[PDB]
Short mmCIF file of C-alpha atoms (C1' of nucleotides) and ligand atoms in Angstrom, two decimals:
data_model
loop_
_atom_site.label_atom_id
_atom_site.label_comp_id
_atom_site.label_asym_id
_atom_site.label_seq_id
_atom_site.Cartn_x
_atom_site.Cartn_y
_atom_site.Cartn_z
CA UNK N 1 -30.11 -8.90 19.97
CA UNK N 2 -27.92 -8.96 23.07
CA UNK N 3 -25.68 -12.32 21.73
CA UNK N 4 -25.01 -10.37 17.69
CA UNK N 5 -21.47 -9.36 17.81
CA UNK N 6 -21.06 -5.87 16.38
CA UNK N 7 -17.28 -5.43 15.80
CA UNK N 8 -16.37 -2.63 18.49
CA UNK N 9 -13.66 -4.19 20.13
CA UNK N 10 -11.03 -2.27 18.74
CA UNK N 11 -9.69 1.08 17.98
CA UNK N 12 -7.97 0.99 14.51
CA UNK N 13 -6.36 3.60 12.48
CA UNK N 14 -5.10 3.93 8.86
CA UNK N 15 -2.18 6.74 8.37
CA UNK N 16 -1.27 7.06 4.80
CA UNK N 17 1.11 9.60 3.90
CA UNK N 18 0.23 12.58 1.08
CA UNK N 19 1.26 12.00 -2.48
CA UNK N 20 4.26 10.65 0.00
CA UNK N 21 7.29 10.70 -2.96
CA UNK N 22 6.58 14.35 -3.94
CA UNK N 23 6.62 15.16 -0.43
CA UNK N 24 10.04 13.83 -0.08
CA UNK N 25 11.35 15.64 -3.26
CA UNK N 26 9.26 18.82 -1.96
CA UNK N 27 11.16 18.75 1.23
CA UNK N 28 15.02 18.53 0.06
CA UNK N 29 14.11 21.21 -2.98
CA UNK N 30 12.08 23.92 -1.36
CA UNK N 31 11.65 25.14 -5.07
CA UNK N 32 8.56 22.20 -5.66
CA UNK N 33 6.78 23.38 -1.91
CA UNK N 34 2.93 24.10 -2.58
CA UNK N 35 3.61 24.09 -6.56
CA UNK N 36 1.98 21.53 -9.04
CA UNK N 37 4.79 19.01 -9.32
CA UNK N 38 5.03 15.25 -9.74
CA UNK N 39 7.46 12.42 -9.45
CA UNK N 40 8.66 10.15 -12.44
CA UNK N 41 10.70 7.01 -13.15
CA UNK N 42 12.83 7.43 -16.14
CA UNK N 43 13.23 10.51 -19.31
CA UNK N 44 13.57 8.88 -22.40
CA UNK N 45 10.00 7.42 -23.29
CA UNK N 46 6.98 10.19 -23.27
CA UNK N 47 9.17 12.27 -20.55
CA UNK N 48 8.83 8.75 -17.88
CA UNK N 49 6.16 7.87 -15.98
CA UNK N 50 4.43 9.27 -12.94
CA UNK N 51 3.89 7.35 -9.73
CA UNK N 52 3.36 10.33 -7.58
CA UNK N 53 1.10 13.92 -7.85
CA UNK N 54 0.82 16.64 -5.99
CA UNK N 55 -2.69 18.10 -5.12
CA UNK N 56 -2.13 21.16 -7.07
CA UNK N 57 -1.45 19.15 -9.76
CA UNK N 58 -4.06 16.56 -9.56
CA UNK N 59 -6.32 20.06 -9.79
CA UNK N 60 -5.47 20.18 -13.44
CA UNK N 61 -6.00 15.86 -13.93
CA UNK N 62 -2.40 14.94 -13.42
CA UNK N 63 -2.61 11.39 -11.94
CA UNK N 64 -0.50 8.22 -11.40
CA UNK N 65 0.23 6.24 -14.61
CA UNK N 66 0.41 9.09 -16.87
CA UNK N 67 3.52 9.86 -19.31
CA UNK N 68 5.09 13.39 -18.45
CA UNK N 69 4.69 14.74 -21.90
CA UNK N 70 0.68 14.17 -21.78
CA UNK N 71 0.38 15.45 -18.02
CA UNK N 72 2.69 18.76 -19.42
CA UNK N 73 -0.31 18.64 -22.10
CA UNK N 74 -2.61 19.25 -18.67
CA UNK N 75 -0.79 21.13 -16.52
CA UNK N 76 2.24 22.85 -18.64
CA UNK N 77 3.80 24.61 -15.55
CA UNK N 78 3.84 21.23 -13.78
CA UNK N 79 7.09 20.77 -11.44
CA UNK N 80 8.71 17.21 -12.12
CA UNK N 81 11.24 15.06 -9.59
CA UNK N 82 12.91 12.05 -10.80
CA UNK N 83 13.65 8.94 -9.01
CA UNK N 84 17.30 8.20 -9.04
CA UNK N 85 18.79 6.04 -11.40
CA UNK N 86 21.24 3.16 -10.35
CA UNK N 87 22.65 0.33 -12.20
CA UNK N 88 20.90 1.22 -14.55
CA UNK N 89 17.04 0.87 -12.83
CA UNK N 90 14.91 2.92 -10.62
CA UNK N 91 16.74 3.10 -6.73
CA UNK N 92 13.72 3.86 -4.23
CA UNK N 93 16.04 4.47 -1.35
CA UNK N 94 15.71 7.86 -0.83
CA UNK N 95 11.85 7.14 -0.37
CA UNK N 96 12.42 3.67 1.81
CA UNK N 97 14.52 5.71 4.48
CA UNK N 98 11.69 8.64 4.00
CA UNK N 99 9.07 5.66 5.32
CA UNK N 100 11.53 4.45 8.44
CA UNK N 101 11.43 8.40 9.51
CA UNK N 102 7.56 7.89 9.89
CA UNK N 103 7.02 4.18 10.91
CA UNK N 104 9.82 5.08 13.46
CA UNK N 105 7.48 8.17 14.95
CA UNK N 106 4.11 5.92 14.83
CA UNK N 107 5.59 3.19 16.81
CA UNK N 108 6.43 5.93 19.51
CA UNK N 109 2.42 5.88 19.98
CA UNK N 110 1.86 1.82 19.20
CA UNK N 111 2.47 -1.39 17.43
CA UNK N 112 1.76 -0.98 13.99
CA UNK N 113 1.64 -2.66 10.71
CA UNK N 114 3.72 -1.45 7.45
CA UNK N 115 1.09 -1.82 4.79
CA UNK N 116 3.40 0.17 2.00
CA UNK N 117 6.13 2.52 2.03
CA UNK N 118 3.89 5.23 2.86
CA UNK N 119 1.13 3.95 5.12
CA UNK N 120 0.68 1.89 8.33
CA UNK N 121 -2.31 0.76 10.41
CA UNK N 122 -2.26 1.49 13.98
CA UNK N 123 -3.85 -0.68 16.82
CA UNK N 124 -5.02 1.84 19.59
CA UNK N 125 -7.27 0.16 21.55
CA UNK N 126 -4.65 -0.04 24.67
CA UNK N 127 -3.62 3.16 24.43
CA UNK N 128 -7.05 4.48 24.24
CA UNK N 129 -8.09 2.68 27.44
CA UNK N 130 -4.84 4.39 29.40
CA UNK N 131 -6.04 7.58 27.67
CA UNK N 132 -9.55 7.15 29.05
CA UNK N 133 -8.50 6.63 32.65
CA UNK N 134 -5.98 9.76 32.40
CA UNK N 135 -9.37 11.97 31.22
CA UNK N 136 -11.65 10.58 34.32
CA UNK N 137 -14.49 11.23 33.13
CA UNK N 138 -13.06 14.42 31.77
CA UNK N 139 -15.20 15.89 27.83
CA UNK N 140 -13.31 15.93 25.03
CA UNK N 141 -12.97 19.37 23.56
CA UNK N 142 -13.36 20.59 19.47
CA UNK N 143 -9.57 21.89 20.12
CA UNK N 144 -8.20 18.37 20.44
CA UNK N 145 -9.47 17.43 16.98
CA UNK N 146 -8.41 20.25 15.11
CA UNK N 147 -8.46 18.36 11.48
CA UNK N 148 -11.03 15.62 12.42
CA UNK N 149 -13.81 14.92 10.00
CA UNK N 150 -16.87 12.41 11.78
CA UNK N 151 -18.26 10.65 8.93
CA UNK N 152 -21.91 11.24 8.30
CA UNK N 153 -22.30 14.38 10.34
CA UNK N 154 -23.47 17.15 9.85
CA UNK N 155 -27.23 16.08 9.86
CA UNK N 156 -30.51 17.25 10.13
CA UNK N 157 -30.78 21.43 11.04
CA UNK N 163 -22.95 26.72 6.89
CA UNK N 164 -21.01 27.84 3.42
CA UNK N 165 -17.34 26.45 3.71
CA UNK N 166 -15.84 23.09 4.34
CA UNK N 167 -14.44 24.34 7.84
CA UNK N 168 -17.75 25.02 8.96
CA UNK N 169 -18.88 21.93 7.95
CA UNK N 170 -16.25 20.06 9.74
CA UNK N 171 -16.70 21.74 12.89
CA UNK N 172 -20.54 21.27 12.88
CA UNK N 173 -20.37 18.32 12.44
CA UNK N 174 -17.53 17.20 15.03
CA UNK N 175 -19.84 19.57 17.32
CA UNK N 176 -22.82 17.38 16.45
CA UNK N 177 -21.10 14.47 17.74
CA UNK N 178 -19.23 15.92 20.78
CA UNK N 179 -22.42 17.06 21.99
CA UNK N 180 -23.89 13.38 21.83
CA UNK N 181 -20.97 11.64 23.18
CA UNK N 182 -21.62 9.79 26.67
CA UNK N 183 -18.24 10.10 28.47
CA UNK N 184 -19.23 8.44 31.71
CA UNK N 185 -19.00 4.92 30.07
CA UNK N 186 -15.66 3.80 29.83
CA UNK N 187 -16.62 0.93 27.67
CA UNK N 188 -18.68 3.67 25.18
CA UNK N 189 -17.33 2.59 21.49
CA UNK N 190 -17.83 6.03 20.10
CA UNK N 191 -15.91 7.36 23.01
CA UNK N 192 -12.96 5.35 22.44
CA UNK N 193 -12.84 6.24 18.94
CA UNK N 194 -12.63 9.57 19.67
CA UNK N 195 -10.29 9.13 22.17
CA UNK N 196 -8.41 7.03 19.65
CA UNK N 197 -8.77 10.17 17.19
CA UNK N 198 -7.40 12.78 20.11
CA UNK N 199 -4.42 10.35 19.91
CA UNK N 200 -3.85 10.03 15.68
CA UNK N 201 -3.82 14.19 16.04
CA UNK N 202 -1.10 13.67 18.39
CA UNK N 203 0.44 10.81 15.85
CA UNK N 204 0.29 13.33 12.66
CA UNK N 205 1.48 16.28 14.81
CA UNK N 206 4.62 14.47 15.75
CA UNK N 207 5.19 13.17 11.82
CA UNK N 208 4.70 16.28 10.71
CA UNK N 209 6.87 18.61 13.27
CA UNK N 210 9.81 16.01 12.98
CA UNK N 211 9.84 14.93 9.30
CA UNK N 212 7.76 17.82 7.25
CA UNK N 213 5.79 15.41 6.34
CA UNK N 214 1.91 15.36 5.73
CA UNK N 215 -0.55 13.14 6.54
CA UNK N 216 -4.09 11.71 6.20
CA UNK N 217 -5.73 9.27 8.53
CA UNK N 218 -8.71 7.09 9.23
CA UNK N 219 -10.54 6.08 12.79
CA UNK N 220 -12.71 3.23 12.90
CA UNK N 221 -12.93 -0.45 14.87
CA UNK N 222 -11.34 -2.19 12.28
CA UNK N 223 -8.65 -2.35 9.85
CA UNK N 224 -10.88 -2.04 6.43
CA UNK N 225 -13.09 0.58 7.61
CA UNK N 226 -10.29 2.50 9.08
CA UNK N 227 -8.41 2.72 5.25
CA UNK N 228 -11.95 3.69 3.78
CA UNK N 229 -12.18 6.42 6.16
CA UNK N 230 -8.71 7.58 5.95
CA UNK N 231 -9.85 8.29 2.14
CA UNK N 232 -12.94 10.11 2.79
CA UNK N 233 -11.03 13.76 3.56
CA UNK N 234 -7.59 13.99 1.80
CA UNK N 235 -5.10 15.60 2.01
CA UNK N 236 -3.40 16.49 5.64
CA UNK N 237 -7.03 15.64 7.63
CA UNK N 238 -8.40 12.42 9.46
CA UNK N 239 -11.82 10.34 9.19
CA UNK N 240 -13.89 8.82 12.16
CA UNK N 241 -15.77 6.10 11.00
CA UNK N 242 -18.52 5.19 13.86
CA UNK N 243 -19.96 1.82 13.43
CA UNK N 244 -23.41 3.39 13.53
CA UNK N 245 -22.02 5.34 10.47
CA UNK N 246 -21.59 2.04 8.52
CA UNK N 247 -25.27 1.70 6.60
CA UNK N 248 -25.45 5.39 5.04
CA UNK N 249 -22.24 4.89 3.88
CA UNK N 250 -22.40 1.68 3.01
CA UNK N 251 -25.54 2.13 1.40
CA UNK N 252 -24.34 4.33 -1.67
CA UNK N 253 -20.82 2.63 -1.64
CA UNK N 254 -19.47 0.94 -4.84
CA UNK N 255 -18.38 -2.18 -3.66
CA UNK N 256 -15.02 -1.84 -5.85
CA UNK N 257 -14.09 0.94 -3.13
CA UNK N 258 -13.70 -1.79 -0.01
CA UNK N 259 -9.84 -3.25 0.07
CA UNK N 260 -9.94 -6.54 -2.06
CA UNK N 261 -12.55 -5.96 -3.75
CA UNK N 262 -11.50 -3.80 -6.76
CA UNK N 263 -10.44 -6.87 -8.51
CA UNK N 264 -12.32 -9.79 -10.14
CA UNK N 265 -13.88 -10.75 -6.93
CA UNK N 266 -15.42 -7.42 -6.65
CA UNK N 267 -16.42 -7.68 -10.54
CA UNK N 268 -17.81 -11.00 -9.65
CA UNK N 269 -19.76 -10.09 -7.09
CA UNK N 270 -21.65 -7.53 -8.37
CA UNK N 271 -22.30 -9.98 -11.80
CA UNK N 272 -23.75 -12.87 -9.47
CA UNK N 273 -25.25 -11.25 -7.12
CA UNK N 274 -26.80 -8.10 -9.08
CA UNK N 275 -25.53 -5.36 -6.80
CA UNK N 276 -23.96 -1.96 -6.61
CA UNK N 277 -23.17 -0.96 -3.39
CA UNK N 278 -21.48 -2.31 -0.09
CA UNK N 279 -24.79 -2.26 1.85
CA UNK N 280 -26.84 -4.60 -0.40
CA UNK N 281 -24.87 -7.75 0.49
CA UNK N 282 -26.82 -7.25 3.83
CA UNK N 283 -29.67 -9.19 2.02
CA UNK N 284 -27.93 -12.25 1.61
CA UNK N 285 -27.47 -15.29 4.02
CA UNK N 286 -24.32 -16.06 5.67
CA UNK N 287 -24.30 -19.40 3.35
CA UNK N 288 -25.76 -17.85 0.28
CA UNK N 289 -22.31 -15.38 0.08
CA UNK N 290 -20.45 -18.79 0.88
CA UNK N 291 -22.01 -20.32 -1.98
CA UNK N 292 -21.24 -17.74 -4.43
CA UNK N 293 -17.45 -16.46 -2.96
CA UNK N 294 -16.26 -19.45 -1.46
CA UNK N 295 -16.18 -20.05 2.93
CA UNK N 296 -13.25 -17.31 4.13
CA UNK N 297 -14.64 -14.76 1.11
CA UNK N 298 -18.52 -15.53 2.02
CA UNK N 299 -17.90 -15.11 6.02
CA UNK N 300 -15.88 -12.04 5.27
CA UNK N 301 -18.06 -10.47 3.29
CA UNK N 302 -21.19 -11.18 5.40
CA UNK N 303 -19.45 -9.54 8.29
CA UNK N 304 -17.86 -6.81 6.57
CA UNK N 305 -20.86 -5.43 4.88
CA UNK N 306 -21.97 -4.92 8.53
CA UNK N 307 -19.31 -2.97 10.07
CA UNK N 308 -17.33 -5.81 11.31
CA UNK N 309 -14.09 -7.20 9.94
CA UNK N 310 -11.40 -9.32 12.50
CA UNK N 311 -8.24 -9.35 10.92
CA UNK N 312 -5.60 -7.97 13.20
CA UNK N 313 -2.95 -5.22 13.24
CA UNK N 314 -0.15 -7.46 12.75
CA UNK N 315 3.25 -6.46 14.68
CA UNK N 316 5.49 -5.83 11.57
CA UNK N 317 7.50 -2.47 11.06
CA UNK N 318 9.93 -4.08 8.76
CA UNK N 319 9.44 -5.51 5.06
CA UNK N 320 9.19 -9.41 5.16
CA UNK N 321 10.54 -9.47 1.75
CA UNK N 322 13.66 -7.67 0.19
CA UNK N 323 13.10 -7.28 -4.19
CA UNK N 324 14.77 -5.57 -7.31
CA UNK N 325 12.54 -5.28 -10.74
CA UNK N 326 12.74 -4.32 -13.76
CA UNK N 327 10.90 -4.22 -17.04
CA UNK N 328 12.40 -4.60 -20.57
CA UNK N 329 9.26 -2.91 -22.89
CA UNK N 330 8.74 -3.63 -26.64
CA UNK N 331 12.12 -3.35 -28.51
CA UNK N 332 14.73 -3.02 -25.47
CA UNK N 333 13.67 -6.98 -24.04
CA UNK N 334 16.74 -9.16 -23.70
CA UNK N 335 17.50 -11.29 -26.71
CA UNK N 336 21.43 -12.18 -25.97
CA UNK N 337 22.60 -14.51 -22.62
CA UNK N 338 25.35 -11.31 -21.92
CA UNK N 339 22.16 -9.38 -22.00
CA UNK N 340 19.94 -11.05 -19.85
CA UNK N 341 23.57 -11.96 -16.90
CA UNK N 342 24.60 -8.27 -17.50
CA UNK N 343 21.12 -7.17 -16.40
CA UNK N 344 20.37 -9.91 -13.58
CA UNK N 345 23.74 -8.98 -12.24
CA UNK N 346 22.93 -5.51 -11.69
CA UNK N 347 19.80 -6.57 -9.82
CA UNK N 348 21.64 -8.34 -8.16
CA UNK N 349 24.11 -5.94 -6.67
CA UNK N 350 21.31 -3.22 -5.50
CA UNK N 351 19.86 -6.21 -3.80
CA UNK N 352 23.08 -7.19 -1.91
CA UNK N 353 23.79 -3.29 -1.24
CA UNK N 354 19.94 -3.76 0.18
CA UNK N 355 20.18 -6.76 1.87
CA UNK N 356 23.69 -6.13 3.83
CA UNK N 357 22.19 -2.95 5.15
CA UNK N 358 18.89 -4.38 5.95
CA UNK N 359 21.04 -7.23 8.15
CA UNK N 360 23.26 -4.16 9.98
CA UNK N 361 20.00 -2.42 10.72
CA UNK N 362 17.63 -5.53 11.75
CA UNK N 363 19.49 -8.34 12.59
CA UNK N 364 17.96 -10.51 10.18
CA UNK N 365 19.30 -12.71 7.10
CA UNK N 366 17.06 -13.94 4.35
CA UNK N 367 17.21 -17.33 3.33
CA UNK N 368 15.79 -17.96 0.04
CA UNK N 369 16.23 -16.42 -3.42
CA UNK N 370 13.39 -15.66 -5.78
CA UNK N 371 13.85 -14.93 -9.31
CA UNK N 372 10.72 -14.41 -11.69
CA UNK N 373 10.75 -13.81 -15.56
CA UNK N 374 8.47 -12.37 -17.91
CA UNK N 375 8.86 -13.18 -21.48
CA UNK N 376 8.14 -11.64 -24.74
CA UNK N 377 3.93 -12.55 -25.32
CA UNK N 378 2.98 -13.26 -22.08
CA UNK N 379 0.33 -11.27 -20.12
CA UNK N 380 1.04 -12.14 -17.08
CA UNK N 381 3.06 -10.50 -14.18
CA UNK N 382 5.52 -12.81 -14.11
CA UNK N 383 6.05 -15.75 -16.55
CA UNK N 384 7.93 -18.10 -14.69
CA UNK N 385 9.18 -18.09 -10.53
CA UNK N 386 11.75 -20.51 -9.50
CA UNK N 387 13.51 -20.26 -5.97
CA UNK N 388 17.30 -21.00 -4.72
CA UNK N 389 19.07 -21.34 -1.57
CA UNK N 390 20.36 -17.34 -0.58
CA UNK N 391 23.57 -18.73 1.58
CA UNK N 392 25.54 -15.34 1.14
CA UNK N 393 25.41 -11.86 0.51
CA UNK N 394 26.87 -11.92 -2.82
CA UNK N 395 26.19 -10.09 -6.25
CA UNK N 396 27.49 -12.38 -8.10
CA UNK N 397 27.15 -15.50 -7.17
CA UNK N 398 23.11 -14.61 -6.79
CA UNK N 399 23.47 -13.62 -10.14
CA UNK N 400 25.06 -16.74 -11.55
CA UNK N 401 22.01 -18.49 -9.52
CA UNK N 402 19.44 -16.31 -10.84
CA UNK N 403 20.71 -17.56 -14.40
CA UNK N 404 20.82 -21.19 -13.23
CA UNK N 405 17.56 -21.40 -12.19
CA UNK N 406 15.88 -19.52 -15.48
CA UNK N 407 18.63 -20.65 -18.09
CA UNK N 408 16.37 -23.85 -19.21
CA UNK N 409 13.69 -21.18 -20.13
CA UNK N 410 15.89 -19.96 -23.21
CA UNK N 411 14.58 -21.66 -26.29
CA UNK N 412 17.24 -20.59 -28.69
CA UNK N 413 19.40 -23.57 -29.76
CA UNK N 414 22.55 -21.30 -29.87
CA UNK N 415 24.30 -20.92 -27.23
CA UNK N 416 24.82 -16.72 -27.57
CA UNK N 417 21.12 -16.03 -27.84
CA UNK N 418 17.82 -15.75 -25.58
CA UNK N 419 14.61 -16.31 -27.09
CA UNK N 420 12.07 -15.51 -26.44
CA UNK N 421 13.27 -12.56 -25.36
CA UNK N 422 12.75 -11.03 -21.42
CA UNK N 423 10.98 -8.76 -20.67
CA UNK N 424 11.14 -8.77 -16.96
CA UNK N 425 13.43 -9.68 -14.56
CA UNK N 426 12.38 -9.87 -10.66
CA UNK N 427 15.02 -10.72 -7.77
CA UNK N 428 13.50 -11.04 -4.46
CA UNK N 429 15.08 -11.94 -1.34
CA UNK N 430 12.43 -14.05 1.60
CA UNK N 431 12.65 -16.36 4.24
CA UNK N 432 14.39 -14.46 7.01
CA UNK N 433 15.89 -15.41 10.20
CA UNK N 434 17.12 -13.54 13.25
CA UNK N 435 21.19 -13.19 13.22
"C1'" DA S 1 6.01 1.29 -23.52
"C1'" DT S 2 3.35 1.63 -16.79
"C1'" DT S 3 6.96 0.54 -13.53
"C1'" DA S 4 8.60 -1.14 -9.16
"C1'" DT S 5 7.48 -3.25 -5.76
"C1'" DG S 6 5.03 -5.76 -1.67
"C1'" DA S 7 1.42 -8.70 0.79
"C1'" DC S 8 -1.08 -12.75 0.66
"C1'" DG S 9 -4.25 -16.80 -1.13
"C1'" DC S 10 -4.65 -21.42 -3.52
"C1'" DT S 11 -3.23 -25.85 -4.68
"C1'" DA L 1 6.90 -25.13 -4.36
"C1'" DG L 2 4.96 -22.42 -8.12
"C1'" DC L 3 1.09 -19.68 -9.71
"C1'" DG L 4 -2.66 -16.08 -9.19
"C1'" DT L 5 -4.80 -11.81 -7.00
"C1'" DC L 6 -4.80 -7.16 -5.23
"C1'" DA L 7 -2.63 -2.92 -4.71
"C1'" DT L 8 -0.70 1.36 -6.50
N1 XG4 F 501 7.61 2.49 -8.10
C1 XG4 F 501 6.31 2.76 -7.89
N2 XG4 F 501 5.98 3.52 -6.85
C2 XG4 F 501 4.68 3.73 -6.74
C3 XG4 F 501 3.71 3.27 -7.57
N3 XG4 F 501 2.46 3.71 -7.16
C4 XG4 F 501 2.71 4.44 -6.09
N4 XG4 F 501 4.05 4.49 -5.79
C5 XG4 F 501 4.75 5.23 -4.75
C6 XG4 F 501 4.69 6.75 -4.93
C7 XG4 F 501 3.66 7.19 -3.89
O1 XG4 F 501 4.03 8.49 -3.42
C8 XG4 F 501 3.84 6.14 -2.80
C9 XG4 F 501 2.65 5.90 -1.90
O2 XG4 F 501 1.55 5.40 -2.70
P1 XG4 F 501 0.11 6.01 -2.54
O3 XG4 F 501 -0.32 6.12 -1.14
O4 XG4 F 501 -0.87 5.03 -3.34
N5 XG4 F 501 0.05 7.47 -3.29
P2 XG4 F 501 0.46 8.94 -2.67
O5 XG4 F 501 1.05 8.80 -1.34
O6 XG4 F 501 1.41 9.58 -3.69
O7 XG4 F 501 -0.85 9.80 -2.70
P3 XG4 F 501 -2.08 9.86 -1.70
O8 XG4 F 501 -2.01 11.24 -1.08
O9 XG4 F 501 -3.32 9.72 -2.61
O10 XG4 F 501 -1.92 8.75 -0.72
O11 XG4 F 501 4.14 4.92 -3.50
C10 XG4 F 501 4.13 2.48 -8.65
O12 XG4 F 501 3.32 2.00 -9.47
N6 XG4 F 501 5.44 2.22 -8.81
MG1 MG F 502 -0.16 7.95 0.42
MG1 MG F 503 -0.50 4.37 0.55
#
DNA sequence: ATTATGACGCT
DNA sequence: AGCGTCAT
């Protein structure tokens, strides 16, 4: 009753940039703007791989993952960018500087957290309240959420999605009770008013698009943001939470796409989000462990505690790349050849990252797959990172993985690579 | 022959 | 420390 906690605290939002690598191409080549068009890593094999689509494109069943030559089989007018090629590898710069542009604009508004290149969560609850006593006791108008979506409405007693929208953000203006400062649908729409502002700012000084959710909390905020893509943003009231919970695949909540999720719905014999409301507190514990059980008991509920952390910046600085089939590494030239050019886009990396952020890391990751194995990486073994150096990180790299080569002679690797991970950590203020 | 990352949990 | 999970 009056003691049950119900997770409004907060005002939490999840911006996540549209197909955010095509938009970058899209903007330096005006020739890809509002044209099917993707971006791919490499030529050679099945035209490369995509990683990003636009929304024209996903129209015809483009999607992430695919080859080129099977999404031209789709869409045979589709528009493709590559990602530049650099020692050799993929370089994501362009698309790293891209994401300081719009991290840069958010934290105009507040502290946020970088979640990926492309997205951010956003803790508004402050800036709400100063908000709040700026409207005194002043409605909020249907022009100040021009692109809002409230999740759930319309209901009860009309063609096009525009109409929809704006019934249903009518709906819920007309029910909102702006004398109570302390209302938790008011400050979500308040915190709403000001992620319009946010996306109006990215957009006017980048050209860049966005989509955005509204909720108390960081899970339910990155489920709404998902609800009404591209270039519009999601309130998610916590009265909202049991409809939509209650036809949700669990496998759509963040974490729990995975074997957790899988395992959940095996043990338990569930669907949706909303049936783990039928389970005790301990039973969940039981099944998914004490952090897992409590979580999920709370989040299946509305309510989820884990905070914006303060973090703009990357905590961790890494160069990959994958050696398929026939092209893995089978000679030691091969395998110092290819660790030292790693190792020199890291140091390019990492001596700009210290310029810009007055920060060294400290400790030097290197992780192996080899020929067989399954897993991500095969083997992870860490060294001191003392300077900013291609090559000697390189010749460390090597030190640290050289007992892995089974080959008796001296000239060959076996079995051979096929991965090769670099990954700068542990940093420290300079 | 999906690739290139990045965050975080467990032991 | 080194490995596994989740994400995309
Ligand atoms: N190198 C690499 N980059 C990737 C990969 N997957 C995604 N990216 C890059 C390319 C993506 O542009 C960017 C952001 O990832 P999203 O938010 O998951 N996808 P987007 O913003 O495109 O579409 P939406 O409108 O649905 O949010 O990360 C990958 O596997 N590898
Ligand atoms: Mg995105
Ligand atoms: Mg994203």
């Amino acid at each position: 009753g009056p003691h049950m906690a119900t997770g409004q605290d907060r005002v939490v939002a999840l911006v996540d940039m549209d197909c955010f690598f095509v938009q970058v191409e899209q903007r330096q080549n005006p020739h890809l703007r509002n044209k099917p068009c993707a971006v791919v890593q490499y030529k050679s094999w099945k035209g490369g791989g995509i990683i990003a689509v636009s929304y024209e494109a996903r129209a015809f069943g483009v999607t992430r993952s695919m080859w080129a030559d099977d999404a031209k089989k789709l869409c045979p007018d589709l528009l493709l960018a590559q990602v530049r090629e650099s020692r050799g590898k993929a370089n994501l710069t362009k698309y790293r500087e891209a994401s300081v542009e719009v991290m840069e604009i958010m934290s105009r508004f507040a502290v946020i957290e970088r979640a990926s290149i492309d997205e951010a969560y956003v803790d508004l609850t402050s800036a709400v309240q100063e908000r709040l006593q700026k409207l005194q006791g002043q409605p909020i108008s249907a022009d100040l959420l021009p692109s809002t979506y409230i999740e759930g409405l319309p209901q009860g007693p009309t063609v096009q999605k525009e109409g929809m929208r704006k019934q249903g953000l009518f709906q819920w203006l007309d029910s909102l009770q702006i004398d109570n400062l302390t209302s938790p649908d008011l400050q979500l729409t308040v915190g709403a008013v000001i992620v319009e502002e946010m996306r109006a700012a990215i957009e006017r000084e980048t050209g860049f698009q966005c989509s955005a959710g509204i909720s108390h909390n960081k899970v339910l905020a990155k489920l709404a943001c998902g609800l009404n893509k591209p270039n519009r943003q999601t309130l998610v009231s916590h009265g909202s939470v049991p409809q939509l919970f209650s036809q949700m695949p669990i496998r759509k909540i963040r974490s729990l796409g995975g074997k957790l999720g899988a395992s959940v719905i095996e043990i338990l014999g569930i669907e949706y989000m909303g049936e783990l409301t039928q389970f005790t507190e301990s039973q969940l514990q039981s099944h998914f462990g004490e952090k897992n059980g409590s979580w999920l008991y709370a989040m299946c509920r509305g309510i989820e505690h884990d905070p914006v952390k303060p973090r703009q910046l990357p905590k961790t600085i890494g160069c990959s790349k994958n050696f398929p089939g026939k092209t893995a590494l089978a000679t030691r030239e091969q395998v110092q050849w290819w660790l030292l050019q790693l190792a020199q886009e890291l140091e390019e990396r990492l001596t700009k990252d210290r310029n810009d952020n007055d920060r060294v890391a400290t400790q030097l990751v290197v992780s192996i797959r080899v020929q067989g194995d399954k897993r991500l990486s095969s083997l992870r073994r860490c060294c001191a990172l003392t300077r900013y150096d291609a090559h000697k990180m390189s010749h460390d790299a090597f030190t640290v993985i050289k007992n892995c080569n089974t080959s008796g002679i001296q000239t060959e690797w076996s079995p051979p690579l096929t991965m090769l991970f670099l990954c700068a950590t542990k940093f420290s203020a300079s």
